Amino acid sequence: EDHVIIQAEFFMEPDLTGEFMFDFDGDEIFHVDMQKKETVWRLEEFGKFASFEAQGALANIAVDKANLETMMKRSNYTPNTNVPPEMTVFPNKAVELGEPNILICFIDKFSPPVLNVTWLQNGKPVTTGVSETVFLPREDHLFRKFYYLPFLPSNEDVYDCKVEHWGLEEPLIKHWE
Amino acid sequence: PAHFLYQVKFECQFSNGTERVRYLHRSIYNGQEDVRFDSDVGEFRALTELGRPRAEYWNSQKDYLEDERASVDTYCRHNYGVLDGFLVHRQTAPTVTVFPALLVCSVNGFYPGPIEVRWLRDGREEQAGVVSTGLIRNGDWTFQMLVMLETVPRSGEVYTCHVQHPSSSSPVTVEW
């Protein structure tokens, strides 16, 4: 098919986490932030050409929780299988010393949608300006997620993306320099 | 500690503008699809035994079958018309450089994914030697792709990186 629109929701227990997003050919259109009760467009410009009523999303998530609890009981409390991520670490653009850039940590093919992702610079945790997407859907019903780290490229800096997930026995750590 | 996950997906598949529209309603417990509405079928289907009760409710709910059947129009064709006003035809031209790593063609910042990236040498395009990462999603509505050419460093000859992407009828070219 030429194009695909996907509305993807989840609720998860005992974590009590839920997300609501729209997807076009594998990129996020928007999500609803559950804390802020707000439609967050993936790029702000999109909100000039479209609108979405956040309150509907929240209602769907309350109903998804209820539907989860019914399926938990009907399944005789069969738990979700932990499927561990795979990870890639790469720069957003062609890298040039001292011209700001963004390091991308892409995490793929995991369930459930819970990650502890840590950026390290020369062995030490860094957080300045970090951003992330929502849990992006896959056809196989596993998840994807992007983490962004603003950096100023140098000769001597080494970066590690460290991911923790219940599907891994030990952390999955990759680097770029 | 055990986890429990429920996923809902509403999919709209489009071909030839909106001549071919397929609506899918997926109910997914612990990553497995239990029950589906597929508008090509036009009835709900219990994919697993766990979905039969949930299929009975759906199928017994007052006007729900007709509402699912009308979703190709009320939801899919509706949402497409909104997205055709900015998303469906978004184009970002690629950014092209060459640099020594072996010779590297960096193609950055382009949408949509379909792209033709060729290595030329003194005017002729070679096929053997070329190694590609393939299409790399950036997650911000851009892709990148590094196309490398294992190359013998011999003075005299110009290597061109030729990039044809829908964003321009005309290619983006970088000599070395």
């Binding site: 929701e9 479209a50 | 709910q61 979703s71 509706h78």
Partner: peptide, 12 residues
């Protein structure tokens, strides 16, 4: 011009 969502039938 509104993106519409659909609701998963609630089990109450």
């Amino acid at each position: 011009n509104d993106i519409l969502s659909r609701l998963d039938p609630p089990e109450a």
